């Protein structure tokens, strides 16, 4: 009856603290426990790779989070550098309590974990996206730990050329967490995409890299952009929408260019082989720096008949538009390519990744969909029609039809009601009219006769803000109220951050304060115990509207209309002493580059937070072990334990 719970992330990162949760159950009121928790070697030998940390609990305080440390020296000495085959480590809690109470053969209860040396966040940016051969290249790297605080750990940078061979390597200390460095590209270097990689010295797997393109070129004076009238082409047999482009070309310093445009059409497939239309090339004189051309009905039909191609087979191919504008009388040449035009059967796309699977019978099913305009921004106000067919629970299946418009940014939350003893549930989500986008998914049901269930209900479907308190409701389903409390934990960046216990009540609520560091995606995991059988459910909550913990503001005094050679009073505003890193980039570099590299922005940093998340889908599972595995934790209660994850990817 009495039990001891072990919670830890499924993956342990070296050189950074590991959080371990410990919990008791069915413990006498006056009874207390004592022991220590540490890692060991994976059966190769029994040296503790971590210093022991004590944990003392009783009935009134039956939970505690332990900030266990895993220093690199102990890991190296005990032997994590000497295993065979795959990386694996053992985490175990030692206490005389198991032998005293459960009369277990051993006082050892542990879990299997996979150890990985990746740690810290490494960002680096180069001088320019694109360089000429024989030109000096400048770059710098920034060294931050888990909390993006500046770090003094030593790193080793490296440079790989276009073919991929190393050209350079520098092992450098960090007094200031920023390391500036320059090197000269060889003159005889052919065009290619170079790569600069930076790793922590003791972290073998913590390699973060960026790429810059090298190509022979000269600085262009103006850029050409081809903007289609609509980024989609409807190919339904009933009708085909008109195809019209707005070819624009402007001098980079603002004024429009006077010249002519030479436009060549064609069909380009997924692989990349483009078949041009022989004829139908359009040449026009630019007026006001813009040229508005279009593809007619009969002309396009004749082009496909010339290629012996039918409208019905136009699925997945792309209408390739290439423009080569000659400035006149300048004589300069500039080329702009269009490859985003997609032949589609519907002007909308449905993203059903967020709809949670394996939902509990007897509680509302939360169907979440993302109605995104095909190759565009999220759509708003677009109705969604969804049919739910509850399969035979013993009676005939029933059809449930719910309609709801998208509240904004493509977010729709449709709470269909699921009856008890449901065998399995079939869904058909259709959005858009006419020519809807069809998405069909099927979800099974948990095996019947289970010990119980736990339902997490989120009254506010809108994503929480930073610093915005989020409240959830928990309700046990399908079992008696033998238990007195249930336990919940919050996971962010693959580490257990919060642990707490709430007493069982009616229509209960648990409030989680959304801190900044929990962004942009944290897992909420909750479980209670029906006798000796744990049941759990884990809801994934995503935080949007990310912004810096501090702030950095760049501003230029007055209007942005200057003349060459005069002074600029650039303004720098922040909230603390910061090693602000600056950079001035000519815009023509973006145009000259074959592929436009987006600059570093908070999207990439917030993704760097997500790179350490071990989540597997939107959460949920039939069993407690499955829920914990999907969340990314290892659970051992002494009788049933989850196996170590096969791979980090979790396909």
């Amino acid at each position: 009856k009495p039990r001891l719970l072990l919670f830890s992330p499924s993956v342990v990162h070296l050189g950074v603290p590991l959080s371990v949760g410990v919990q008791l159950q069915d413990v006498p009121r006056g009874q207390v426990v004592k022991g220590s928790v540490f890692l060991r070697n994976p059966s190769r030998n029994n040296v503790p790779c971590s210093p022991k940390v004590d944990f003392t609990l009783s009935s009134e305080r039956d939970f505690a989070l332990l900030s266990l440390q895993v220093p690199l020296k102990d890991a190296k000495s005990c032997g994590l550098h000497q295993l065979l085959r795959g990386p694996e480590v053992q985490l175990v809690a030692h206490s005389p309590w198991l032998k005293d109470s459960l009369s277990r053969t051993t006082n050892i209860q542990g879990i299997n974990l996979l150890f990985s040396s990746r740690r810290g966040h490494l960002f680096l940016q180069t001088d320019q996206p694109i360089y000429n051969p024989g030109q000096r290249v400048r770059y710098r790297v920034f060294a931050l730990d888990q909390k993006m605080r500046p770090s003094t750990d030593t790193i080793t940078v490296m440079v790989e050329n276009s073919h991929g061979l190393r050209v350079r390597k520098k092992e450098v200390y960090m007094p200031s967490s920023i390391f500036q460095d320059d090197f000269v590209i060889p003159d005889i270097s052919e065009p290619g995409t170079w790569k600069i990689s930076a790793r922590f010295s003791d972290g073998l797997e913590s390699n973060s890299s960026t790429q810059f393109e090298v190509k022979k070129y000269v600085l262009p004076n103006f850029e050409v952009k081809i903007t289609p009238g609509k980024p989609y082409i409807l190919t339904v047999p009933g009708h085909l929408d008109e195809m019209q482009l707005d070819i624009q070309a402007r001098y980079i310093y603002g004024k429009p260019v006077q010249g002519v445009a030479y436009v060549r059409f064609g069909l380009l497939d997924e692989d990349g082989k483009k078949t041009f239309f022989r004829g139908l090339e359009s040449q026009t004189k630019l007026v006001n720096g813009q040229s508005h051309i279009s593809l007619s009905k009969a002309e396009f039909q004749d082009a496909l008949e010339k290629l012996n191609m039918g409208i019905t087979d136009l699925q997945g191919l792309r209408l390739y538009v290439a423009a080569a504008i000659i400035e006149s009388p300048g004589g300069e040449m500039e080329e702009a390519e269009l490859t985003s035009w997609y032949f589609v059967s519907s002007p909308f796309s449905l993203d059903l990744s967020k709809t949670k699977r394996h939902l509990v019978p007897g509680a509302p099913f939360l169907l979440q969909a993302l109605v995104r305009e095909m190759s565009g921004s999220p759509a708003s106000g677009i109705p969604v029609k969804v049919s739910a067919t509850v399969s035979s629970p013993g009676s005939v299946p029933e059809v449930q039809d719910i309609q709801q418009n998208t509240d904004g940014s493509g977010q729709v939350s449709i709470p269909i009601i699921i009856p008890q003893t449901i065998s399995e549930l079939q869904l058909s989500v259709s959005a858009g009219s006419p020519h809807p986008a069809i998405a069909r998914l099927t979800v099974a049901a948990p095996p019947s006769g289970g010990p119980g269930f736990l339902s997490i209900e989120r009254p506010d479907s809108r994503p929480p803000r930073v610093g915005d308190t989020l409240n959830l409701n928990l309700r046990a389903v399908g079992s008696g109220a033998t238990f007195s409390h249930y336990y919940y934990m919050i996971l962010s960046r693959g580490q257990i951050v919060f642990m707490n216990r709430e007493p069982k009540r009616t229509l209960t609520s648990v409030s989680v304060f959304v801190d900044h560091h929990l962004a942009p995606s944290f897992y909420f995991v909750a479980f209670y115990y029906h006798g000796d059988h744990p049941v759990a459910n884990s809801l994934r909550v995503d935080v949007q509207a990310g912004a810096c913990e501090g702030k950095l503001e760049l501003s230029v005094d007055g209007a942005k209309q200057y003349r060459n050679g005069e002074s600029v009073k650039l303004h720098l505003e922040t909230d603390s002493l910061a090693l602000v890193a600056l950079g001035a980039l000519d815009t023509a570099l973006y145009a000259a580059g074959s592929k436009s590299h987006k600059p570093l922005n908070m999207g990439k940093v917030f993704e760097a937070m997500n790179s350490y998340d071990l989540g597997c889908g939107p959460g949920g599972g039939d069993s407690a072990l499955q829920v914990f595995q999907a969340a990314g934790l290892a659970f051992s209660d002494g009788d049933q334990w989850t196996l170590s994850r096969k791979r980090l990817s979790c396909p």
Binding site: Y173, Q180, V184, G565
Partner: protein, 695 residues
């Protein structure tokens, strides 16, 4: 006659033969302005031919390119009195004057601004203002080519190569304007220093004067006067020198010979010079400079025959040539060919380059070109040899202060012998041996005729200097000559047990001592002081302008991230080290955290190795022994020796004639007290001995 409407705006003009046909008109404008056109031609009574006249303002070359840096303000061509600031990006240390105010002569002031990171084998030669450079690689054996811009003419070396000794071949190019000239005050130090090197054996000096029709009788008289004062000065230094006087024309006439023994007496040479007259030159009034250079060539090949092919008496014969010409060679061919013959025949190379210096002093204002003076004169790093002065008055002015070497100050230094057959002491005359009461031996370096600079740790028994002894080099015996000590001054910040409370057993901070000898040392080929940098002595030894600073000497001597240096071993041999500066210094000094005996409790590397220490010992570098501590850590630049540090301590002792390295923990590493961080203390205890530069 010619028309009279030839007035210039803001200036005057002169005529040679009135308004008659064939008369030449000369245009003159005040300083800071240039005549345009310079001169006119009256034609055959036609219109005033020109190669409206206005004194256009002086405008001064602007930086065509400034690598790895920025310059403000940015202008097409800076006017007179203007200023420009040169501050460059991080990781790059500036050299030369950051602020350059361009003088009314068409030149900037100060050395050209450039910042180098030191990774290159040779220092960054830089882009002189108004010039361009091709090739951005400073590896050993690579080359750079310079080209002027707009209407400038290039004076200097059009091509420089990074030699093995870390000095680019040739001088630093300086793009110049046809109308620019030189001030006497600017060029007097350059001439003085260059002749000081020519004096640094027996020296042969040739003086070439101009006596064509273009040079006037009074101008030739001033040429004679300048030559006479120059000869008077060169004989006042009591140096083994012979001077010859040649006055050339369309055909050259030799007035004095070095073959004749008569050239070593002052009265005879001045009498021979005074007997020169313009009259004996009217028989042909051309300017055949190649003929005069060929006369010098015949002079020296007669010296070659009479002395001998291989005899020592000729090998130590150095040659310096002066030309007081108006730069209008118009007959006999290109003067450069005879200079080529001279270079071929003296066997001049990267080593024997010191034996041949050519000075091309141009004089005049209207027929003077830059190419002939630049080509004719020699091209050496850090020196200028091609000059022009607007008037002969300026020639006399610059010459009469050309050797302004301070009287009776003396205190020469940094002179050694670089022959393998020479003795160890003669090669390193500053090296001394120090014997304290502990019976252990240390080394030191002569910094004057009375004072010796060494390490403080060599005196562990205390401060009783009366029982200490020193041995300097002495010609009469290899044992040296023993001196007693008048007083000893140990650095007050020195305490080997200052940091024992932090687990550091021995701390070598302020490991510096100055020892005064009882009797003055007799200067000789075995006993000479080494030049302590950041003084007038080392400045004159480094071929640098008067207004140099101490930071400048740091930037010049310690000019690379890896600067080769030397120290003297116990047996007297010279060993090779490389000083690591800048970024490489930190990685050089980080190996002290892995010491096992000196520092058992060491958490901060900076606590035992501070900025007061140079760092060396990687690669195949030699490691000084305990007995060699206190000896000078010196580098050789421009055939002189300079003490940038001295041995303090090391992480591996090879002497624990015999030496042995190893390849385990810890790797050998050495630290020397960088003399540049101790400047206040040497200034306190040495100000009345050497003349220290502004910091």
């Amino acid at each position: 006659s010619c028309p009279q409407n030839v007035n210039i705006s803001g200036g005057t003009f002169t005529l040679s033969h009135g308004w008659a046909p064939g008369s030449l008109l000369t245009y003159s404008c005040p300083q800071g302005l240039y005549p345009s056109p310079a001169s006119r031609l009256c034609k055959s009574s036609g219109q005033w031919q020109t190669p409206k006249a206005v004194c256009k303002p002086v405008r001064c070359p602007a930086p065509v390119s400034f690598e790895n840096g920025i310059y403000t303000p940015r202008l097409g061509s800076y006017p007179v009195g203007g200023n420009v600031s040169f501050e460059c990006e991080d990781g790059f240390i500036l050299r030369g004057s950051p602020v350059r105010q361009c003088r009314p002569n068409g030149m900037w002031d100060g050395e050209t601004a450039v910042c180098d990171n030191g990774a290159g084998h040779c220092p960054n030669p830089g882009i002189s203002l108004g010039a361009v450079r091709t090739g951005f690689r400073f590896g050993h054996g690579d080359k750079v080519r310079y080209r002027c811009s707009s209407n400038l003419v290039l004076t200097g070396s059009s091509e420089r190569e990074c030699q093995g000794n870390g000095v680019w071949s040739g001088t630093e190019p300086i793009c110049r304007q046809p109308y620019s000239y030189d001030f006497p005050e600017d060029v007097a130090p350059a001439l003085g220093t260059s002749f000081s090197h020519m004096l640094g054996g027996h020296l042969n000096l040739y003086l070439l004067l101009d006596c064509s029709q273009s040079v006037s009788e009074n101008d030739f008289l001033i040429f004679k006067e300048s030559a006479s004062l120059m000869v008077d000065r060169i004989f006042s230094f009591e140096i083994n020198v012979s001077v010859a006087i040649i006055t050339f024309a369309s055909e050259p006439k030799v007035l004095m010979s070095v073959l004749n023994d008569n050239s070593r007496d002052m009265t005879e040479v001045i009498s021979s010079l005074e007997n020169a007259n313009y009259k004996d030159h009217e028989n042909g009034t051309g300017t055949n400079t190649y003929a005069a250079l060929n006369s010098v060539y015949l002079m020296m090949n007669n010296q070659m025959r009479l002395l001998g092919m291989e005899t020592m008496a000729w090998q130590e014969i150095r040659h310096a040539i002066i030309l007081l010409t108006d730069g209008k060679s118009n007959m006999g061919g290109s003067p450069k060919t005879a200079v080529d013959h001279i270079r071929e025949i003296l066997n001049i190379n990267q080593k024997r380059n010191d034996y041949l210096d050519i000075y091309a002093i141009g004089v005049g204002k209207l027929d003077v070109d830059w190419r002939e003076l630049n080509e004719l004169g020699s091209k050496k790093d850090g020196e200028r040899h091609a000059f022009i002065l607007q008037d002969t008055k300026a020639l006399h002015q610059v010459f009469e202060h050309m050797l302004d070497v301070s009287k009776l100050t003396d205190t020469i230094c940094g002179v050694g012998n670089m022959s393998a057959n020479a003795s160890d002491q003669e090669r390193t005359p500053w090296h001394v041996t120090i014997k304290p009461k502990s019976q252990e031996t240390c080394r030191g370096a002569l910094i004057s005729d009375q004072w010796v600079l060494t390490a403080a740790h060599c005196f562990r028994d205390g401060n009783d200097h009366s029982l200490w002894r020193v041995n300097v080099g002495d010609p009469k015996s290899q044992w040296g000559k023993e001196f007693l000590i008048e007083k000893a001054v140990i650095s007050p910040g020195f305490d080997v047990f200052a940091k024992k409370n932090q687990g550091i057993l021995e701390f070598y901070g302020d490991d510096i001592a100055l020892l005064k000898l009882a009797q003055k040392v007799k200067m000789s080929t075995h006993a000479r002081p080494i030049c302590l940098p950041c003084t007038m002595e080392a400045n004159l030894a480094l071929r640098r302008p008067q207004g140099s600073t101490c930071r400048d000497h740091e930037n010049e001597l310690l000019n690379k991230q890896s600067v080769p240096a030397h120290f003297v071993a116990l047996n007297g041999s010279k060993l090779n080290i490389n000083l690591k500066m800048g970024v490489e210094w930190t990685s050089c000094a980080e190996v002290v955290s892995q010491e096992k005996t000196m520092f058992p409790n060491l958490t901060d590397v900076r606590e035992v190795v501070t900025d007061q220490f140079l760092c060396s010992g990687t690669q195949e570098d030699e490691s000084p022994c305990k007995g060699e501590s206190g000896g000078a850590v010196f580098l050789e630049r421009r055939f002189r020796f300079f003490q940038v540090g001295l041995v303090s301590w090391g992480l591996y002792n090879p002497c624990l004639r015999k030496r042995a390295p190893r390849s385990k923990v810890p790797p050998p590493r050495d630290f020397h007290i960088n003399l540049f961080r101790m400047q206040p203390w040497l200034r306190q205890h040495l100000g009345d001995v050497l003349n220290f530069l502004p910091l």
